[PDB]
Design a protein around this nucleic acid. Structure first.
Ligand SMILES: [Ca+2]
Ligand SMILES: [Ca+2]
Ligand SMILES: [Ca+2]
Ligand SMILES: [Zn+2]
Ligand SMILES: [Zn+2]
Ligand SMILES: [Zn+2]
Length: 315
DNA sequence: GTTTAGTTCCTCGTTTTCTCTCGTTG
DNA sequence: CCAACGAGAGAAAACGAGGAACTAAA
């Protein structure tokens, strides 16, 4: 017990909890504290970068190998890309969480960016399988609520072989574990070009502005308001006859700077991923995942629930 | 000629689960 | 050595969107 209260105290003091041998990659253990291991520290930076690129531990393992790096087990890399020990923190099973006394090896940002990658990879099962379909994990059934799965079916007659790609609710694949819901079964090629269509339109739409949202001409006005507030001021208390001209002429050469600026800034404006279809496959689905949250399907009608809103005003 | 469907096994990255062992603590 | 125990490393089993055949209706 009292020893336990001690371990806790040791952690709250900023010291590392796990100090076992070879369970501290990128850190050497001296005394009971850990200090950066230049060598392994480098590998973590490389790992952390590559991963942030590929967004796949396996993909990572494949690359590392090619680079002549000794490759470790999947879970080991999963731990290193997770676990804030590498970005500075020390923890104690939910009871204690605080910045430790060791040199972090990863930026608190690049950390939480990677943690972001795992977050999404979570909500999108198999999105990294080579068989991941363009609209993977994006389509849901308005009937029964489960989501759609991509299906394929092929048969031949004579010598001609037939292939077909659909997107059916799960109730139409797991016939045994659940009964049908009556919602449509879509032709992949369609649903897709359909969605791609709204996505291009939507994309094109965003980008363009409201006049209210777009000073070099709004200050041109400030001076006009000065010559106002100034003259009338003179009629009351104000300034002396002379203090008036020494000033009113300033805002004028000030006007001319702006009028020449404005009329001139005119001419040089008078005389003056958006391409989805070009993106490789994986990048396409990723693009979608970033731009679309959910595609609801109701028989014949589909409703895209965008993720990113637009800049302009709506009604 | 074309599709729509049901069985009955695969795939293969990511996730869980579950022992082994380390080792700091008063 | 006491006693308690959190959690990486590893091995192995579980997940789950998708797949390949072949067969029998529509
Ligand atoms: Ca102490
Ligand atoms: Ca942790
Ligand atoms: Ca159009
Ligand atoms: Zn359904
Ligand atoms: Zn808009
Ligand atoms: Zn309005």
């Amino acid at each position: 017990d009292r020893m336990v209260m001690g371990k806790i105290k040791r952690i709250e003091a900023g010291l590392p909890l796990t100090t076992a041998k070879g369970r501290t990659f990128g850190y050497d253990v001296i005394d009971t504290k850990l200090y950066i291991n230049e060598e392994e520290a480098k590998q973590l930076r490389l790992i952390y970068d590559i991963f942030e690129e590929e967004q796949s531990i396996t993909f990572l393992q494949k690359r590392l190998k090619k680079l002549g790096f000794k490759v470790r087990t999947y879970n080991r890399y999963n731990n290193w890309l997770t676990n804030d020990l590498y970005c500075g923190y020390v923890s104690y099973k939910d009871k204690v969480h605080v910045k430790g006394i060791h040199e972090p090896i990863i930026s608190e940002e690049q950390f939480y960016r990677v943690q972001e990658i795992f977050s999404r990879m979570g909500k999108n099962p198999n999105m990294n399988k080579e068989s991941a379909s363009l609209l993977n994990n994006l389509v849901v059934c308005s009937k029964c609520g489960l989501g759609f799965v991509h299906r394929r079916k092929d048969t031949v007659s004579r010598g001609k072989k037939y292939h077909y790609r659909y997107y059916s609710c799960k109730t139409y694949k797991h016939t045994h574990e659940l009964e049908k819901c009556g919602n449509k079964i879509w032709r992949a090629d369609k649903l897709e070009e359909l969605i791609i269509d709204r996505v291009n339109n939507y994309s094109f739409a965003s980008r363009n502005i409201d006049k209210e949202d777009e000073s070099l001409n709004e200050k041109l006005k400030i001076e006009h308001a000065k010559k106002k507030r100034l003259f009338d001021l003179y009629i009351n208390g104000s300034y002396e006859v002379s203090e008036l001209d020494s000033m009113m002429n300033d805002i004028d050469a000030q006007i001319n700077y702006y009028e020449a600026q404005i009329e001139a800034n005119e001419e040089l404006k008078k005389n003056k991923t958006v391409d989805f279809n070009s993106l490789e496959f994986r990048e396409k689905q990723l693009y979608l995942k970033s731009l679309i949250n959910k595609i609801y399907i109701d028989g014949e009608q589909v409703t895209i629930e965008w993720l990113l809103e637009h800049h302009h005003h709506h009604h």
